[PDB]
């Protein structure tokens, strides 16, 4: 069985090791939770989870700074999903939202 699921929304949990890894996946068409094999998960969705990232909706950007690395620009983003703001890389934040920051000046 070689195929990839076309209705994968996000990966919730991981319980496997190596190439034989399993993901807890929420669907885009039925909203049910069941375990699947990582082989049947698209590389883009799987990459983001392994990078320790997660998907959310952003309210607005409230803060801006230079990262600890001193190279990359970071933004402080207010999240709809939760009450606390976090610092995320410029690439990780919605492109239209950061344009809203310029009006604040």
């Amino acid at each position: 069985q070689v195929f990839e699921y076309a209705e994968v929304d996000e990966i919730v949990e991981k319980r496997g090791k190596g190439k034989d890894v399993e993901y807890l996946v929420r669907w885009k068409d039925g909203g049910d939770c069941e375990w699947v094999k990582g082989v049947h998960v698209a590389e883009d969705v799987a990459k983001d989870y392994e990078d320790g990232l997660e998907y959310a909706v952003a309210e607005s950007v409230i803060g801006k700074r230079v990262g600890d690395d001193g190279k990359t620009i970071e933004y402080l983003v207010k999240w709809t999903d939760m009450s606390d703001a976090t610092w995320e890389p410029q690439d990780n934040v919605d492109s239209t939202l950061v344009l809203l920051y310029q009006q604040q000046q």
């Binding site: 990232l53 997660e54 959310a56 909706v57 983003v77 999240w79 939760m82 919605d94």
Partner: peptide, 8 residues
């Protein structure tokens, strides 16, 4: 749309 964020 959706934005990504570290595992918090």
């Amino acid at each position: 749309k959706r934005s990504k964020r570290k595992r918090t």
